[PDB]
């Protein structure tokens, strides 16, 4: 049925900028777990074509989970 969505904070919550200085910085940090979380923080590994966003991640995640789901019965 009809669902009402308040527009407050959509653009605020799509923002998912995780640019290269944060990943290289936390890869530089001495904690081995934080190195284990960000494998792309190595500057020897070229970062890539690498933009945000959040809704692209949730869209590709629903599409990917939908794919792995519908390959089974």
């Amino acid at each position: 049925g009809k669902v009402l969505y308040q527009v407050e904070g959509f653009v605020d919550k799509n923002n998912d900028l995780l640019y290269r200085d944060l990943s290289q910085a936390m890869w530089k940090a001495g904690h081995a777990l934080i190195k284990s979380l960000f494998p792309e923080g190595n500057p020897a590994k070229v970062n890539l074509k690498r933009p945000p966003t959040a809704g692209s991640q949730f869209k590709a995640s629903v599409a990917t989970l939908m794919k792995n789901l519908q390959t089974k019965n």
């Binding site: 640019y19 290269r20 890539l48 074509k49 690498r50």
Partner: protein, 375 residues
Amino acid sequence: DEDETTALVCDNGSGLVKAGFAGDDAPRAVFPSIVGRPRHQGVMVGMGQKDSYVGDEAQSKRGILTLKYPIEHGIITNWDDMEKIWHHTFYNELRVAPEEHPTLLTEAPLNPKANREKMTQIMFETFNVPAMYVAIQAVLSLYASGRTTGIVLDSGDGVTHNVPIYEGYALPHAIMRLDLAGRDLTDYLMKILTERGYSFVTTAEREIVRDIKEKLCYVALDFENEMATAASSSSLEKSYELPDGQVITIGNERFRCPETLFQPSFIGMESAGIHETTYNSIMKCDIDIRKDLYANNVMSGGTTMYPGIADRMQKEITALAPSTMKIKIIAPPERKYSVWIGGSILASLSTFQQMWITKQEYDEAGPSIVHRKCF
């Protein structure tokens, strides 16, 4: 080869090819826009030694080549040489097939339209791209600034624009195009280094003069007292090691190079300078736009990496514009790349995907379709 439909942002303004993918921060393939040709005979049997050297490979062999920029003042002169530059661009440096990717070219406003039209003809007939667009350099320089309102100064290797844009709308009557840019500053710098005593006449030596211009020049905030300072003492004399041997030491030539950009009477080109083409482009706009052009003056292309050019720019426009105005010369240090970055943004928008000049629409109305779809 590629499992994506990512749009290609290829950007030769006039003097430096930068290219890459849509939705990316840094341009992937950056190399100079030169084609090489051996000006004398070969001797060693079994070498390879093809009669073409394009991009930075030509700068590896620039001692034995006649370097030749195929595009001059934003106008493409030799279409075969520019086809070599594009072939090396997509097939060697960027290393991707143009058949599967839309392309986003760039050019100057007030262009001869055979450049735009024949550029679209080469992009569809030779490389067979599915989609194509002819982006304005300065508008993309405003896309990377994160704004929708501002007047744009970029000043590439062969052209400068000062395109004013207010709230998503450009002002096409207030547009400007001055042909004084970094290559003319390179030739003037070569002339005044000949005046000091270092004779540079070869195109490879001209490339060395371009290197000295990039490394060792600043803008001279007040040119008169800086000129008297350079005439006073040797605190401005700086040594630069040339490739293979003899060092140089430049004095007043360190700052008389970009003063030519602010004063074209040194190179004898009849103009008003950068700071008065900005003010004339603002005064050609209407009355209720100008403080939004004063607070958002963008200076984000090439040939602006001279230190303190925002101080000379703001310090001069403040003398030209009336008082109680906030002259904000926006100089984001990511410039020389911001036209590519605006290419990456504009190629990655959702609204842009019905503005592509595409094949089967190119073939419908021929090569003139760019003058009715693009601008």
